[PDB]
Write a protein that binds this ligand. Structure first.
Ligand SMILES: CCCCCCCC/C=C\CCCCCCCC(=O)OC[C@H](O)CO
Ligand SMILES: CCCCCCCC/C=C\CCCCCCCC(=O)OC[C@H](O)CO
Ligand SMILES: CCCCCCCC/C=C\CCCCCCCC(=O)OC[C@H](O)CO
Ligand SMILES: CCCCCCCC/C=C\CCCCCCCC(=O)OC[C@H](O)CO
Ligand SMILES: [Mg+2]
Ligand SMILES: [Mg+2]
Ligand SMILES: [Zn+2]
Ligand SMILES: [Zn+2]
Lengths: 156, 156
């Protein structure tokens, strides 16, 4: 159990909180108060209002990525220490940690500070969007492709 | 690599889809069309409309649980086969699988079939709620407790 590897794990759960908090802060501000902060400057709120799907998508991708990442880390420690019971341990320990620290706490926190979080997250997320939004947008276009071939969605 | 252990993994990703689909189908129906299906009978729609937080909470808990669970499984195979590179492999492989099969496909699917999914999921989720909703509701009350002690939320 190296020291960095706990720090990495904490960085990751922080990132999950960052993503779940920013998701909440963006959507509670949307649309009216987002538009109102957008016509005033400056300046992240204009970027959030104008392309909001770009933002929520990156988040979905960034939130699952670091959630899965962090779980996969912890499982490697759980299984190196405890064998096949580590899967049990890690599922429990992580289900607690993503829920409480990467979801329920940040989301709770965001509704009380939507403007400051949104302002602080929009550029970092906009950066991670250079790569994540095409990935997410690709996934979805194939997803809905796969669906319509399968007749589970109106033909086109 | 046992055969059951792939089946378990698939069951889990199905469950994640079940949860992300039901989450979408419930909230796109809410509130007006949910109320309209609720005053007509019978009968899950009445249960969904009346205590909706009970439902979305179980889902949040059930979706993270099986997401983390399935990732922790796959990591154990990734690391038994590939050593410390398995964490890399599993994060990649799973981030693809939860996103595409446990999220982007089901959510896409649900908006086109909200009434049938909602009707079919409300009792199963209501069952899983006997246990998950107190857990989630506990998490949150401590969460907001922890927040107010820390002065990040209006005192009380
Ligand atoms: C805006 C919020 C940004 C992250 C706050 C940390 C909250 C929880 C992070 C705790 C990490 C797990 C220990
Ligand atoms: C905010 C909290 C940040 C993280 C807090 C500490 C991380 C402990 C996590 C899982 C233990 C699961 C068993 C892992 C086996 C270790 C050997
Ligand atoms: C209502 C939808 C219920 C689950 C449908 C399966 C969709 C995806 C499940 C695929 C599992 C991963 C293989
Ligand atoms: C709907 C799809 C259901 C699941 C499809 C098959 C699962 C493959 C998953 C991860 C492979 C990661 C490497 C695992 C190492 C195996 C040895
Ligand atoms: Mg999160
Ligand atoms: Mg899911
Ligand atoms: Zn104005
Ligand atoms: Zn009516």
């Amino acid at each position: 159990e190296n020291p960095w590897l706990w720090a990495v794990l904490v960085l990751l759960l922080a990132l999950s909180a960052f993503f779940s908090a920013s998701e909440t802060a963006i959507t509670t501000l949307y649309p009216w108060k987002l538009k109102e902060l957008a016509e005033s400057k400056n300046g992240p709120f204009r970027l959030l209002a104008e392309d909001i799907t770009r933002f929520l998508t990156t988040i979905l991708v960034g939130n699952n990525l670091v959630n899965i990442a962090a779980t996969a880390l912890v499982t490697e420690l759980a299984t190196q220490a405890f064998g096949s019971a580590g899967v049990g341990v890690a599922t429990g320990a992580m289900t607690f940690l993503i829920l409480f620290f990467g979801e329920i706490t940040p989301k709770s926190l965001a509704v009380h500070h939507a403007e400051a979080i949104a302002r602080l997250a929009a550029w970092p997320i906009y950066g991670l969007s250079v790569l994540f939004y095409p990935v997410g947008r690709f996934f979805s276009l194939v997803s809905g492709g796969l669906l319509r071939l399968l007749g589970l969605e109106p033909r086109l």
